Amino acid sequence: MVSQVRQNYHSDCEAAVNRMLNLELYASYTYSSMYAFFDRDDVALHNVAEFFKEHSHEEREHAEKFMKYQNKRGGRVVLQDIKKPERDEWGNTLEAMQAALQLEKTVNQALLDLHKLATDKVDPHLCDFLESEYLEEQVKDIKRIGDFITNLKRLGLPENGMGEYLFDKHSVK
Template sequence: MALASSKVSTCSSLSPIVGDVPKKFISSMSFVLSNSPSSSSLTLSKVGGRGNLMRVFASDLSTPLTGVLFEPFEEVKKDVLAVPITPNVSLARQNYTDESEAAINEQINVEYNVSYVYHSLFAYFDRDNIALKGLAKFFKESSEEEREHAEKFMKYQNIRGGRVILHPITSPPSEFANVEKGDALHAMELALSLEKLVNEKLLNLHSVAGRNNDPQLADFIESEFLNEQVEAIKKISEYVTQLRIVGKGHGVWHFNQKLLHGAE
């Protein structure tokens, strides 16, 4: 509320009486309430025979003091809020660009491809002539986690009114033996590179959300994926370090037992 003494009204121009106000609450004889050029003017005058009261007059109380009137039935007439009547068109879609939709489908493909590689690693370490059950367990769980991520993105695509398009998945290798490093270290370094790749793709997707002014997509990526991804990178980095320390010999078996029994 702003006081504007230059626009004080006089008693002769005011109607009707708003009410009586105790004099002790009045700091001046007259004032104007103004929060817009069309605000009502108020003035105060003494009431005859009642020296302890002031009378308040208003010239116009028809204009809302806030200057804002929400009219929902007028607002919904905007074209952008119209409900589609064309068949096979999403009713839920709003502020969701084609670029964002395509980027989500690409991320689904990334998650499925990484899941497929991890599943191949699971099969490799589960062989009878490899028999590292702890590593097999780790990569099977990693594969399932990446598939769950893909399904999260698919569900989100449907929530926003996009259409899920599944792209082809590249066939991963089935052999992971490495004479120099050993298969355990070689596989874990591959996993670390894949997790960093996924993180890079997630950050690119977040950039798409920002470029298209889509805070809801940005929030989804931040709350569901980004922190979890850096934690995965940290964990696998530690595994790589531990495998480098133990080398290719008996220490790999102990590392495998740690993964098998869930020890940190």
């Protein structure tokens, strides 16, 4: 039955890592959709699209990390469908940064939930993995999205076309 390498690894932590994986993939795809929206000719915000495209890659990397992690602890990667995103169309920069804030908070909650599971099962290696690789990155992302949303409001979104334009030239590279 069990991997020659498995040690102190609970079944449930294994399953949780598979859930978290798929969730990282769901996040990726969502962002990949924003990139396509912001590259549309009637949207035309190139730096905002590039920003979501980057995040989309950040997220896909986060997933791989879980695959690697699973194999290392001797658990077995089991894949589920990656569900299409909530919307096909994202309104504008602020609607999108707002979706992004929730998507990040959702995923951060799953993380913190998995950390709690790991503490309950006394798997310090999983706790620390999450602490070093994920937890601090979500708190930077959320803080950076928060800052954007604030600035986007400052710029008079949703209504102020010129403020949306400025944001794209000045807050992303």
